[PDB]
TrEMBL record, chain A:
Species this protein is from: Human betacoronavirus 2c (isolate EMC/2012)
Subcellular location: Virion membrane; Host endoplasmic reticulum-Golgi intermediate compartment membrane; Host cell membrane
Comment, domains: Fusion peptide 1 (FP1) and fusion peptide 2 (FP2) function cooperatively and have a membrane-ordering effect on lipid headgroups and shallow hydrophobic regions of target bilayers. They are considered as two domains of an extended, bipartite FP. The membrane-ordering activity is calcium-dependent and also dependent on correct folding, which is maintained by an internal disulfide bond in FP2.
Membership in a protein family: Belongs to the betacoronaviruses spike protein family.
Post-translational events: Specific enzymatic cleavages in vivo yield mature proteins. The precursor is processed into S1 and S2 by host cell furin or another cellular protease to yield the mature S1 and S2 proteins. Additionally, a second cleavage leads to the release of a fusion peptide after viral attachment to host cell receptor.
The encoding gene: S
Record text on subunit structure and interactions: Homotrimer; each monomer consists of a S1 and a S2 subunit. The resulting peplomers protrude from the virus surface as spikes.
Disulfide bridges in this chain: 24-34
Name used for this protein in its record: Spike glycoprotein
């Protein structure tokens, strides 16, 4: 798989090894997740690019 | 700019008192606005810059 510069929201475990990641570029929901720096965000209608 | 004088009613020295009583209904007063709400605007990221 090719590597591209991307901004990724990373969930760091207490063990210190990431088990979850999110990419802002793919999908409208991922940009909402990148906003607030949170994997889970409040339900609602949000503007997108 | 002039101060218009309101009708002047003298106070009687005697126990009996003098009062001014209206003779006509004179309806038709009106005019009020509250500005309860304002327009809602959402900024668009990336496209604006």
């Amino acid at each position: 798989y090719k590597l591209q510069p991307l901004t990724f929201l990373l969930d760091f475990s207490v063990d210190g090894y990431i088990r979850r990641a999110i990419d802002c570029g793919f999908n409208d929901l991922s940009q909402l997740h990148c906003s607030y720096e949170s994997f889970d965000v409040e339900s609602g209608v949000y503007s997108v690019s | 700019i002039a101060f218009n004088h309101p009708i002047q009613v003298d106070q009687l020295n005697s126990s009996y008192f003098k009062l001014s009583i209206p003779t006509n209904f004179s309806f038709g007063v009106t005019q009020e606005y509250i500005q309860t709400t304002i327009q809602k605007v959402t900024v668009d990221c990336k496209q604006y810059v």
